[PDB]
């Protein structure tokens, strides 16, 4: 009886990344109680190393092997290994980055599809490249806009797959992708970490379409290369605990990072407005969902 949504490895994982972000990325100031904690912050470059969840002897993790597994069902084929695979825990708000690709067909997962307030996690057939940079050293010399590049073609193909898998679960109703309704800048925008810089990037370009079928769609046409504009912050809202925190700038120079997009975090509006249409927006912020996306194929039992 697997259950990715009530897994306990995911909470341990979470605590692991929090502790990894202490030491690795120390904030000058946290504001909470207010407690107003201060701590020396040396400029640093951050890149998450992989983590493994380990089973204490006398306990074990079972690894499900269903190439397509929803995450909340009896698992037919089951294995028993000592430690989970290596998982590099990117903390990212809207798009899952560097996560393992789904075997065979695209997979979408919810604890409850029907509760519009439960998050849908998306795992991809194949990965989409995203490239982000903040060129202008920091204003000396050229004024350049920090930005992200995605392929319109590959994004369109990925959307086409996501639509086929969503339409299955939603009775074939036309499905619409739109931007975040409201929220903190972190979740309104594709927020991520590249070279110790805290990027906020505008994904609306990513989610401006109407799909009636897996063909016959609206708003998807455009230039070959999608260019998301970004802002870069240092006083940010914390993901680890409810508060604000100020970080250090990084070791100087151009930040350039290319990340596979292996997953999405969508929520649908729903509610009794009908219209025979479903609206999906990007979401995230509970990083547990990010770990879930990797640990759906694992569970701990006593021996």
């Amino acid at each position: 009886d697997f259950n990715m949504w009530k897994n306990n490895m995911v909470e341990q994982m979470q605590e692991d990344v929090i502790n990894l972000w202490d030491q690795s990325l120390k904030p000058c100031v946290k504001l909470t109680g207010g407690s107003v904690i201060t701590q020396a912050c040396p400029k640093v470059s951050f890149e998450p190393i992989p983590i493994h969840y380990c089973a204490p002897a006398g306990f074990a993790i079972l690894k499900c092997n269903n190439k397509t597994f929803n995450g909340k069902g009896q698992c037919k084929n089951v294995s028993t290994v000592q430690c989970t695979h290596g998982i590099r825990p990117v903390v990212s708000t809207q798009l899952l980055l560097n996560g393992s690709l789904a075997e065979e067909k695209v997979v979408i997962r919810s604890d409850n599809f029907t509760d519009n307030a439960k998050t849908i996690i998306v795992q991809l057939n194949e990965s989409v490249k995203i490239n982000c940079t903040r060129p202008s050293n920091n204003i000396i010399g050229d004024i350049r806009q920090a930005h992200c590049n995605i392929s319109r073609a590959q994004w369109n193909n990925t959307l086409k797959q996501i639509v086929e898998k969503l339409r299955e679960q939603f009775n074939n109703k036309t499905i619409v992708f739109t931007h975040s309704s409201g929220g903190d800048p972190e979740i309104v925008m594709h927020s991520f970490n590249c070279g110790g810089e805290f990027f906020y990037c505008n994904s609306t370009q990513l989610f401006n379409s109407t799909w009636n079928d897996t063909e016959k769609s609206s708003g998807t046409e455009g230039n070959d290369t999608i260019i998301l504009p970004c802002r870069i912050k240092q006083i940010i809202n914390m993901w680890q605990e409810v508060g604000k925190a100020m970080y250090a700038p990084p070791i100087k120079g151009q930040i350039r990072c290319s990340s596979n997009i292996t997953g999405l975090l969508l929520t649908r509006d729903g509610g009794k407005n009908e219209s025979e249409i479903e609206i999906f927006r990007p979401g995230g912020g509970d990083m547990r969902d990010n770990w879930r996306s990797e640990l759906y194929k694992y569970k701990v039992v006593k021996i």
Binding site: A117, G182, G183, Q240, E241, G270, G271, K272, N273
Partner: protein, 175 residues
Amino acid sequence: KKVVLGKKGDTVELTCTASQKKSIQFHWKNSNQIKILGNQGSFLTKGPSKLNDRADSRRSLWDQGNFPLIIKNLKIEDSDTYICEVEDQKEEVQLLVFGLTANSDTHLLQGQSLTLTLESPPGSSPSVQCRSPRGKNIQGGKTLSVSQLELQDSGTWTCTVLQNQKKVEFKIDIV
């Protein structure tokens, strides 16, 4: 079954509390299952409701399992039944918003007549009682009038709108 009244243009805090005294996922929806506002992680999400730019919370309390929905500058259309799904329990509140405007010339010359009207939400069956400066009463189911206006009635009127055995007060300055 909670019933909270609210004056138009006022602010209300619809309370919600958890068994645990730590922060966890909570969602405020309205009757039509439209997501009003929630939390993902330590982050505030705002759903696509009508309340969007007036809804907010108080995240400083989240840490002790307290997830209030705050609606500012109230409107009659905001009258609804709001639910706070947290920890797999469904707290229900019903918010009723009333206005009581005088829409007066600001110069009721003697013998002129009010001029007092009530704005009310669908379903509500509000009773209004208006008390004059002197102590004179006027009763109105949906509207209020003074048959003749005398110099004694001038001053600050105290109106009580009753609804579901709960009350609310509008004061109006008249001349």
